[PDB]
Structure formats: C-alpha cells, structure tokens
Amino acid sequence: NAKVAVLGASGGIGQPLSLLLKNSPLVSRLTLYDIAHTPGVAADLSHIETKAAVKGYLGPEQLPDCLKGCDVVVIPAGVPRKPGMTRDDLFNTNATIVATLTAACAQHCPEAMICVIANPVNSTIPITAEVFKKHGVYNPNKIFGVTTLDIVRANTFVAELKGLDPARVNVPVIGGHAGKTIIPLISQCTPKVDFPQDQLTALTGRIQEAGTEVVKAKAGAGSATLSMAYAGARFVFSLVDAMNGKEGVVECSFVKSQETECTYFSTPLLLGKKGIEKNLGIGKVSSFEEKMISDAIPELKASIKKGEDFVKTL
Amino acid sequence: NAKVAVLGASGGIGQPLSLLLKNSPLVSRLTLYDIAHTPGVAADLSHIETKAAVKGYLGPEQLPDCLKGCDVVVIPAGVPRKPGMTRDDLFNTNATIVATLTAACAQHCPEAMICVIANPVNSTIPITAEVFKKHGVYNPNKIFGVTTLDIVRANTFVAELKGLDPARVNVPVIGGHAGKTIIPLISQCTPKVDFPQDQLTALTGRIQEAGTEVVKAKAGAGSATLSMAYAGARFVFSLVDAMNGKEGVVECSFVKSQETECTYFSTPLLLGKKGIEKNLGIGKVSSFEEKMISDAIPELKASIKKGEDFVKTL
Amino acid sequence: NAKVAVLGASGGIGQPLSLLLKNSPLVSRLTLYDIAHTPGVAADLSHIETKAAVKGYLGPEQLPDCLKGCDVVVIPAGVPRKPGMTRDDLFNTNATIVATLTAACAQHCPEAMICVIANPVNSTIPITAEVFKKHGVYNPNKIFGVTTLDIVRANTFVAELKGLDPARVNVPVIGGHAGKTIIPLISQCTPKVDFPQDQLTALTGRIQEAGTEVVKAKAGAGSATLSMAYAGARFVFSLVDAMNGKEGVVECSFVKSQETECTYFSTPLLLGKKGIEKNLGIGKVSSFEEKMISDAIPELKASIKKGEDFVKTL
Amino acid sequence: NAKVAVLGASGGIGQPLSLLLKNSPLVSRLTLYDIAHTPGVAADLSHIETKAAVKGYLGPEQLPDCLKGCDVVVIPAGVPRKPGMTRDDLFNTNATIVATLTAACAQHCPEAMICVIANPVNSTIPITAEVFKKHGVYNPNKIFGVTTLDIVRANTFVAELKGLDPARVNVPVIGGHAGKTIIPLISQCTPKVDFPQDQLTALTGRIQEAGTEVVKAKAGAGSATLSMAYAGARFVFSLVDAMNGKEGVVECSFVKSQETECTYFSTPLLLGKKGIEKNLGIGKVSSFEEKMISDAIPELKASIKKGEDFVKTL
C-alpha cells in the first residue's frame, strides 16, 4: 500500500521510472510532478492494468497536493550532462532544483523517505539534509542519495568478464557518485572473483567512467535514462519492501555517515521499517580499495561543503 | 533464450519497450534498430544487470544485421498522432515505414514472429502480409497486429468501476484497433460483471476512444508510449512463453482470420510453438455486441483493402 | 510603421520569421503569440538594436492584446510534416488551430491583412474565409494563403539551371500549395528562359516536390523553417510596401478567385493600399501548363470542400 | 566573393545565423557544419533566392570539405545555459568543442578569419589562439571573440531610456563577455547622453546581466539565439565589408591585446583587409569606468589562464 511521489516525472529518467513503479504491486498510489507534460504522462500510465492509482500534478501550485501523505519521494528531476561536462558542472542549476523540491517535502511530507537521484549527488544530499534541518524535521535515516546504478553497472561488468549471470552477482560500491569517489569493492563481490591487477584496474576505471561513457554514446541527447530508471526503481522497491517488513534488504546509498571523516558517504545499508535499520559499514577491504578510499575523501569533503555552503546563502 | 528485435527502438514507445524486454529473463539477445540515437539507447540498456545482450543498429545498411537470427520482431516504429488526428492520418507515413521494415524481415528473418504495433493496425497488418507474400515466405500463423493495449485498458476500466484488482480481470476485445472497430466483449468478462446499458455504453465508448483521450491529454507531445510499451511487452512475453512450450496461453490479436467476412480480424488466439495454434473465435455475444460487430465490418474491410492497395502500388 | 502580429511565434517558422520582421525598418511594432515560450522569444528579440517594439503574449487570455491595432497578421502556427506524410494528412490537426486563430483575428483585427502559412493551405484558406464570414467581416481582398516559398524556390532553381542571379529572376507560380496543384509558369518567367524539355520537366517536378525534398532531408526533424521564414517575411514586406502606396507590387497568393471554377486559386496579384488591387489572372500559358491546370482542378476543389465542410461541422 | 563556414549550424544560434548570412549579398558561398541535422538545414536554406551557394556537411569526416577555401569561419557551436548556470559551467564542454573545431580550421583553412561565439569567450579565444600556435599558423589579427551582442544590447537600452532611434546609438563596450568583465563605456556613447549615477549603475548592471535575463525568461529553453544570430551576423558583415576594402569599419571584439596587463581584452578595433588593422584602445574613461576595468582584470586573467592550461592537457 505504498504511496510514492515522483518529482520530475516528465523527464528522461522520470517517465520510464514512473512506468516501472506503476507496474509494481508494491505501489498503491503514484503521484507524478513536473513543470510540464505530467497530465499526459499520468493519463498514459493510468491505463495500465495494475492497482496503483496514478495522479498527475503540474507547477509549484500543485506540488503540495502531490506530496500530501506520501511514504516515499523519488527525485529524478535535474538537468542532464552533455558530452565534456562533469557532474559538478550541473551543480548550480540542480542545486536550486533540489533545494526547492526538498523544501516542499520538508513542509508537506516530512516523514517520507526522500530518494535523490539529481546530480551531483555528492552535493545534493547535503543540500537536502540542510533544507530539512532548516524546517526542523531532519531524519538522517530517511534521506538517500541514489547510487544504485553504480552497483548495477559493477554487477553487469563483473558478470560479462567472468561469464556469469548478472542477476546472481553483487558488488558493493562505496564512497560517492562521481569519478574517483565511485569505489567498487571487488574483493567483497559474491561470488568471489579474482582479476589480475591490470584487469582489476581497467574494470574499476570503467565502472567509475560508465556514466560519461553513456553521455558520450548519446552524443548530446542527454545521459543514462533507462538504466537509471531501472536502478531507481530497484532502490525504491527495496525501500518499500523494507518498509513493509521484508528482511535482509541491503542497498548501498549515499547517506549521513560516521564510517569515515566524511559526514556523508555511501556504504551497504540494511533497510527496515524506519528507513536505515543499520549502516553495515565499509568492512574488510584490499590495499588497492583502501588507497581509493583515501584518494576519494578530499573530493567528497569538497563536494559536501559546496552543497552545505549553497544552503547557507538562502 | 529468445532473440528479439525492436524496430523503432529510439522512439517514444521503443525506448520503454526495449527497457521492459531487457529486464525480462525470457530474452537472451535484444537487437535495437532506428534511424537515429540507437547506439546511445543500446549503451544505456547494456548496463542493466540482466542476461540479455544488447546491440544497437543505425540506418538501413545495418538493418539486416539487426534481424539476423531473430525469433521475434516487434515494430513500434511509427509517427504518433497529434490532437485532432485520426489513426488513418498516419497511414501514408506508417504504411511506408511498415512496408520497408517488414520487407527486410521477409528477406532476413522470414521464420520470425512479426508483432506490428505501428498504426493504423487495421491496414498495416494487411501490408505486412502482402509484403511477405511478395517475397514468398508468408506464414499467417506468425504475423500479429498488437491490440493488447485495448485489452489492458478494458481490464483497468472494468476493475475501476467494480472496485476490483485489474490483475484478476480479463476482458476479451475483438475486431480491430481503431474507433468503433474496437469491440470489448464485456459479456465474456472474467469475473462476470453486470452493468446497466447506459454504463456499459459509456464503458464501451471509453475503451474505444482511450487512445484519443491520451493524445488529447498529451496536448501535442505524442500518443500513448508507456502503457503501449507495457502492452507490447505483455504480448511479446505471452508469445515467447508459448514458443518455449507454455500451455493455455491465450491473447487477442489482429491476424489473418476466417471468423467473419473480413480477411483480417482480432479474436482470442491460443498461442504455441508454431505461433497461432488455434483461433478461438468470437464465441457467443450479446445483441449489443453483435450490433457492434456488424457495424464495424465495413470499416475493417475498407482499412484492409487500403493496406492491400498500398502494397499493390509499390 | 507597420504593426505585425505573429501567431505561432515560438515554433520552427515563427522564431526566424519574427527575427526577420524585427530586423526590418518597415516594422514599428511586432507582437508575438503562442501557447508556450513566447516571453523568452520576445525577451531575446527585444535586445536587437532596431526600432520595432517587441511584445510577447502567452495563452488565450492575451491573444486579443496581441492582435489589437495590427496591420498584418502572419499565422505560421501548425504542426509540420514527417517524411511520407502529405500536407493533407495535417488537416485534422491544423484545421482547429487555424479556425481558432482566425476567429480571434476576425474579432480583434478584422481590417488587418491575414497571411496564412499553416498547411494544408488549399483547405486552411477556405476555413479562414468561412470563419470571417461567420463573424460578418469577410473581406476577400485581405485574406492570403502564403504560397511565396513556391515562387522563391522556382526563382532559385531557374537561376541555378541558367547560371543567373536569382535576385533578377521572377517565375509566376499558380494553382495551390500541394504537389500537383503547384503550377510553375516557366513560360512567363522573367527573363524569358528556354529549357530543353527534359530539363523543363525535371525543373517543374523539383518545384512541385521541393517541400517534400526538405522534409525527406530533415528526416523527421520537421519541414522547411528558415526558407519559409524568408518567404513569409518577403510577402509581409510586399504587403506593407503596397499599404504604404508603392506602385506595381505583385505577389502570387492563394486567394478567393474567379479565374477558374475553383473558388480559391493562386495567381499573380497587384497589391494596393487595401490588399488585393487587381487579380492579374492566369494569363497566356503553354499547352504543358494548361494541362497542369486541368490536372490540379479536381484536387483543389476537393481540398476546398474539405475546409468548407470542416467549418460546417462546427 | 566571401566563403563563410558556420560550425554548429544546426543549433539554436546556428540556424538563424545561417539564415541571415544566406540572405546577405556579401556572401557567395555558405558551408554549414554540425554533427546532426545539417543536411536538412542546408536543403532548407538552399531554396532561398539569393546568390550564396549553400552546402551542408555532417560529422568529422566531412569537416575538412566544409572548411577548405573559407575566408571566414564563425563558430556558434556550444551548449547553451540553463537557469542557475554560470557561463563557467559551460567551460568543460565548450572548450572541447572549440579545441576540436579550431584545430580543424588551423589544418584546413589557416588563413580564414575565425569568429568565436562559443562561451565562455574569455577562455575560448585563448584556446583558439593556442591551438593555432600548435599548428604554426597563429595570426592574432584574424582571431575574434564575438562580443557584439553586448554592444547591440547597450545601444538598445540607451535608446529606450532616451527615446532615440537605436540605429543612431553607439556604445563602446570593453573587457570581456562574462558578468563584471562586461564594461559599457557610457561616457563614450554617441550621441552624448547624461545619466545620474543611480541610473547609470542600473543601466550598467542591466547590460552586464542581460544574458542571464534572457536565460531566466526562456525558463530552461536555452539562452539568447535570435539576437545572438543578429549580433553574429552584424560582426561577420562588418568584417567582410572591411575585407572588401570598406574604410572606417570599427567593432569591439575580444582579441589578443597589449592595451592592458591582460593578454586578451576587448576594445574598439579598426577592421581592414588583414583583419585587425588597428586596436583603438580603451581611450578616455570616467572614474566609474576606470574602477570597473580594475575590478575586471583579475577575473579576465584567470579565465585566460584557465583556457591556456586546458590546451596543455590535450
């Protein structure tokens, strides 16, 4: 009986994401928000033979009605990358977007799970947290930076190289969601896999640059949409399952953390009825993986401070 | 184990359809075709953690490679309606698209199952058949006009009026896929439902004009995409299941038919390893439903001849 | 000091057309209307260092304000063709667009010159006329189906074949604006040009199919925009010159006509202070050109009745 | 006689710019380049009844054919701003675009005038210069950062405030093209105008933020396109006129400079057959203007350095 809001539902990620959500028997009400096209998207989806009641909402005047009574809010809203851009180049525009939408969440559904897809996640989660603090309703167990696509990619790339079924591969990925902050823990992969250091370095590099690879491949027509819809759907379903009392639900996500000196960090999280049940931590890692964690912390701290400083000027 | 081609994979229907197919454990290879953007879409989808190998093809030169060894070909390729248009306003453009694509199918994967989504279906299926006849490889048990969205809509609308779960509702829909040729057999609905004639006529009208309702809702941004992807995926999965040896698989579809005076007609079909195993026919219908069939036949025969005459001029 | 309104100013034709008008010393006020994006287009254009005052209007509330006091209204509003479509395939969408916009013109600037670009012109001019008749303000000397791009094309193609300066070439084009109804009168060209038959036939066909040529070349990204903006601007400037009292201003345009049995027809028109001063008629033509007129008449009459019937269904 | 290449001809600026160039009797050959849509744009423009021969080129394989024999190359190519973005956010994308395109210019038409519109101009001109240096063909009198839109805006705003014909207004604008580096010299305006400091400050701020104002007004639909096409065309025509031997042609442009400590800077330039004939310098300025110059130099220096360092990484 989960009530889910999608903010940015008319965009490239938002539409196929809303489809996957509508198709699931976990969702009872699907409220869609954007600045354009939502009524059409809602009409389209409302015809699908599943139980989820689909409602479309349009413009900041209707945003409160979209959020009212929501259990989960997913935020794919945001400007995508063009070839040559870094995720950091999107900060100025997407920071304003996230601050506005999460302010409405703080006011109208403060108890909801907030899942931010909007890049750069390393900065937009700190923004979300500070906005919630401003409204006096900050719960760090309920705010999630969606990094699930990194794990999905890692699983796929490991499966391809080792001739495995990616459905039965699980690579923990930690740190953040940008460049060298993406740290795939191949040593913790199930099933156990052994790559030589040159192949391991190549695999790790491809995981880190996978987003840019897709941006390049689309050649100006945006960034990952369909795989991001898949990964965002996976995360929401995991979260909704856990809220309904499903046990053993573990997902990596960029959250308020005390695992490192970084105040926000991605690690495997046991999810439960109140959101984050337990942060399962970094765990035992190789020297190579330790080196990556060390190199990533400087950029993570910088991205975090950037997001915090943006909210200070509001 | 199925090898599925999606012709028009970069379009509004094509992209979410390709996503749903990539997510399926029934698909082992997914080849995508379009005249633009296919490499970007293929790169996007290839990151998803499922077994299906994804490959993107671009331009008519690469169309043969896309079709090589395919088991099922799905054709969402086509121009969508704008508000005010009838499906027949798309005839000239989509007839040419279907004629070109199905000609490539006849040459390069004649044994494959051909699922045509491109509208107007009442003419484009006749076009497909005549193209296959011209190449001397016409198998009427393997060419399908996808009407599944009509059934999906009928199930949803009946479920909403009776307060049922759409997953437990099954409404046979017969005839064709345009206006009054869409004939929902509410008298054969499982479970049995009783409407007074005024509500039954309103429900019947809603099902018939649902496509136009979505076009009006999208207000220039195309026609049904996400619900059509769902409906298209449903039909493909039913078909692939039946091909692997699943029993009792029944789907309505616009096909070569001897059930009425129309040479092509939509009825529930028992699917199997060779495609259509048995046409289950119209069955017993109400007087109201009998009148709808009688009134639809002239339009169906007209649309069929229009498609046949188009191929005849080529 | 002309006041010009552009209805559909945010579209593919509208924006470059608006630029050309803003750049002209003949325009003192430029009012722009559309259902989206107009404020941004007006803001952009308002920075240009010419005298024309630019104002952007958005939505039905503001449409009357755009039209009040206008000398000329240009209506590029309408959906463009995709490859394989005929101009007639756009009728059912563009008919309502033209009906709505010309009704506002009839109410708010009935004395203005009404220049309809929206296709299919052979049907949308009849619509415009009947709308003006319904409002009791029909002046056939002020309603113009813009065929100017046919003449511009003919001039270019003749000039290229003969190696002439296209600025010194003038080819009358008569009939209508769709395929075989486009009748270039190469026999009346200035300077007089003599082509061998095979070149003459190829030239004539190229002129007739030029729009489809551009649609093909654009491969789904619409139809002629930049050259249509040029041609539309040329026609407006000719109208304004004539309104300012310039002598001998001649333009072909699709207008109410008694030159043939067709109630609307394009011929060279002497323009004056009140619009059409004198219809100069078909004049002396060749046998090849006479046969083209004969072939065009049935299609034109069909297109005209289609537009007339549409208004009668309202 | 002038052969002009437009690199980025299919974009928002490129299309209307190409139209204005096609319309000009100063242009005899027009070559259009982009990575998509160019064939359609070229076909469209090739129908216009002016002498300029139009040809379209698609993809890096055809870029050399586009550039050979060119007298002037204009580069509007580049990603536009979204609301929130600074021009600096576009650096990474547009730097790569400019680096690639200007490398091709240095290889295939090193004698051509190079007019860079792509922002941030304060960095992309340094990129252009260094790329030409690498190929041993650097001519600083032929490389221009197009700042003309700032002058066009200043003229319009001054004219509007004083009720003047903007055609008779001329405001020199110096420095660069980004925020506080845009320095309008109102003290050197012709005709002489007098504003109180409060008005002068607001007018000055209005000119500096004009680009951001349009981005806001377009609300996500890009940045200035039509006015930039006007301003780009103006500059190209001034340059081509000067190349034809017209005397007294003066335009402000961001060029290699020794007028200040900045190695690149915008001031009024006397144009001629060699490109830059003479740099006319800053001239006599007010205290207010002197202060703006002092405050801008640090940012200009950083932008120049940033561009130079980028080329080192290639």
Question: Residue C150 in contact with residue C182, Cβ under 8 Å?
Answer: yes
What are the φ and ψ backbone dihedral angles of C219, each rounded to 5 degrees?
A: 55, 45
**C83 & C177 share domain:** no
What are the φ and ψ backbone dihedral angles of B51, each rounded to 5 degrees?
A: -70, -30
Question: Residue D70 in contact with residue D3, Cβ under 8 Å?
Answer: yes
d(CA B9, CA B36): 9
**C201 & C121 share domain:** no
Q: How far is the alpha carbon of D168 from chain A, nearest alpha carbon, in Å?
A: 39
> Which of left, alpha, beta for D182 (phi over 0: left; psi -120 to 50: alpha)?
beta
- Tokens 């040029």 label which residue? C230
**D42 & D85 share domain:** yes
Q: Which of D46, D153, D218 sits opposite C47 (nearest CB)?
A: D153
Q: How far is the alpha carbon of D267 from chain C, nearest alpha carbon, in Å?
A: 20
**C175 & C135 share domain:** no
d(CA B37, CA D312): 33
Half-sphere exposure of C183 (CA within 13 A, CB side): 28
C86 shares contact with chain B (CB less than 8 Å): yes
B213 shares contact with chain A (CB less than 8 Å): yes
Residue C312: count other Cβ atoms within 10 Å of its Cβ: 8
A90 shares contact with chain D (CB less than 8 Å): yes
Nearest to A125 by CA among A178, A84, A172: A178
Q: Which of C37, C44, C214 sits opposite D226 (nearest CB)?
A: C44
Which residues of chain B from 147 to 176 reach within 8 Å of chain A, CB to CB?
149, 152-153, 155-156, 159, 165-167, 169
Residues in B touching A167 (Cβ below 8 Å)? 25, 49-51
To test the contact with chain A by mutation, choose from D88, D89, D127, D215 the residue with the greatest count of A C-beta atoms within 10 A, namely D89
DSSP for residue B186:
G
- Give every CB contact of residue B275 below 8 A, 6+ residues apart in sequence: B113, B139, B141, B142, B239
Q: How far is the alpha carbon of B136 from chain A, nearest alpha carbon, in Å?
A: 38
> Which of left, alpha, beta for A24 (phi over 0: left; psi -120 to 50: alpha)?
beta
Question: Residue A253 in contact with residue A235, Cβ under 8 Å?
Answer: yes
d(CA C161, CA C195): 9
d(CA D193, CA D158): 8
Question: Of B115, B146, B177, which residue is a domain's last?
Answer: B146
CATH number at residue C58: 3.40.50.720
List, as residue ranges, the binding site of C for NAD(+): 8-14, 34, 94, 117-119, 228
Question: Of B146, B164, B193, which residue is a domain's last?
Answer: B146
Q: Pseudo-torsion of CA C149, C150, C156, C157, nearest 10°?
A: 150
**Residue D29 is labelled as binding a ligand:** no
Partner residues linked to D253 by β-bridges: D267
Record: contact D85-A93, CB cut-off 8 A: yes
Q: How far is the alpha carbon of A36 from chain D, nearest alpha carbon, in Å?
A: 11
Nearest to A87 by CA among A113, A123, A61, A59: A123
Question: Residue D213 in contact with residue D83, Cβ under 8 Å?
Answer: no
Say how many domains are in chain B: 2
Question: Of C103, C124, C146, which residue is a domain's last?
Answer: C146
Residues in C touching B94 (Cβ below 8 Å)? 84
Separation of first and last alpha carbons in chain A: 37
Domain span at A64: 1-146
Question: Residue A7 in contact with residue A101, Cβ under 8 Å?
Answer: yes
Neighbours of chain D (3+ CB pairs under 8 A): A, C
d(CA D33, CA C181): 35
Resolution in Å equals 1.9
3-state secondary structure of A271: strand
Instruction: Find the closest chain C residue to B89 by CA distance.
Output: C89
Record: contact D19-C155, CB cut-off 8 A: no
Q: CA-CA distances (angstroms) from residue A149 to A166, A231, B238? A: 13, 5, 29
Partner residues linked to C275 by β-bridges: C272
Structure determination technique employed: X-ray
Q: Which of D20, D44, D166 sits opposite C225 (nearest CB)?
A: D44
DSSP for residue B23:
T
C294 shares contact with chain B (CB less than 8 Å): no
Record: contact A93-D86, CB cut-off 8 A: no
**B215 & B276 share domain:** yes
Q: Which of A25, A51, A217 sits opposite B43 (nearest CB)?
A: A217
CATH number at residue D174: 3.90.110.10
Active site residues of D: 177
Q: Which of B36, B84, B92 sits opposite C85 (nearest CB)?
A: B92
Record: contact A43-B217, CB cut-off 8 A: yes
Q: Which of B36, B84, B96 sits opposite C92 (nearest CB)?
A: B84
**B175 & B262 share domain:** yes
**A125 & A217 share domain:** no
**B136 & B156 share domain:** no
A30 shares contact with chain B (CB less than 8 Å): no
Long-range contact set of residues D306-314: C-beta below 8 Å, sequence gap at least 24: D306/D91, D306/D123, D307/D95, D307/D122, D307/D123, D307/D124, D307/D125, D307/D126, D307/D127, D307/D130, D308/D126, D308/D127, D308/D130, D310/D95, D310/D99, D310/D123, D310/D127, D311/D99, D311/D126, D311/D127, D311/D130, D311/D131, D311/D134, D314/D99
**B49 & B105 share domain:** yes
Question: Residue B7 in contact with residue B75, Cβ under 8 Å?
Answer: yes
Q: Where are the alpha helices (DSSP H) in A219-286?
A: 226-243
> Which of left, alpha, beta for D78 (phi over 0: left; psi -120 to 50: alpha)?
left
- Give every CB contact of residue C302 below 8 A, 6+ residues apart in sequence: none
Q: Pseudo-torsion of CA D258, D262, D264, D267, nearest 10°?
A: -70
Pull the structure tokens for residue C209.
């199919």
d(CA B136, CA B36): 31
Neighbours of chain C (3+ CB pairs under 8 A): B, D
d(CA B228, CA B222): 12
- Give every CB contact of residue A304 below 8 A, 6+ residues apart in sequence: A122, A123, A126, A262, A263, A264
Which residues of chain D from 36 to 55 reach within 8 Å of chain A, CB to CB?
36
Pull the structure tokens for residue A151.
């794990």
Q: For residue D184, is the peptide bond before it cis, meaning its omega torsion is within 30 degrees of 0?
A: no
Neighbours of chain A (3+ CB pairs under 8 A): B, D
d(CA D75, CA D118): 6
The full DSSP string for chain C is: -EEEEEETTTSTTHHHHHHHHHT-TTEEEEEEEESSSHHHHHHHHHTSSSS-EEEEEESGGGHHHHHTT-SEEEE--SPPPPTT--GGGGHHHHHHHHHHHHHHHHHH-TTSEEEE--S-HHHHHHHHHHHHHHTT---GGGEEE--HHHHHHHHHHHHHHHT--GGG-B--EEE-SSGGGEEE-GGG-BS-----HHHHHHHHHHHHTHHHHHHHHHTTS-S--HHHHHHHHHHHHHHHHHHTT-SS-EEEEEEE--SSSSSEEEEEEEEETTEEEEE--S-S--HHHHHHHHHHHHHHHHHHHHHHHHHHT-
Q: Where are the alpha helices (DSSP H) in chain D?
A: 14-22, 38-46, 63-67, 91-108, 121-134, 148-162, 197-208, 210-218, 226-243, 287-312
Instruction: Find the closest chain C residue to B93 by CA distance.
Output: C84
Q: How far is the alpha carbon of B255 from chain A, nearest alpha carbon, in Å?
A: 24
Q: How far is the alpha carbon of C129 from chain B, nearest alpha carbon, in Å?
A: 21
A220 shares contact with chain D (CB less than 8 Å): yes
The full DSSP string for D225-243 is: -HHHHHHHHHHHHHHHHHH
**A133 & A154 share domain:** no
d(CA D227, CA C49): 9
- Return the ∠ at Cα C113 (arms to C107 and C116), rounded to 5°: 90
**C160 & C80 share domain:** no
**C137 & C9 share domain:** yes
Neighbours of chain B (3+ CB pairs under 8 A): A, C
Q: Name the amino acid, one letter, at D254.
A: F
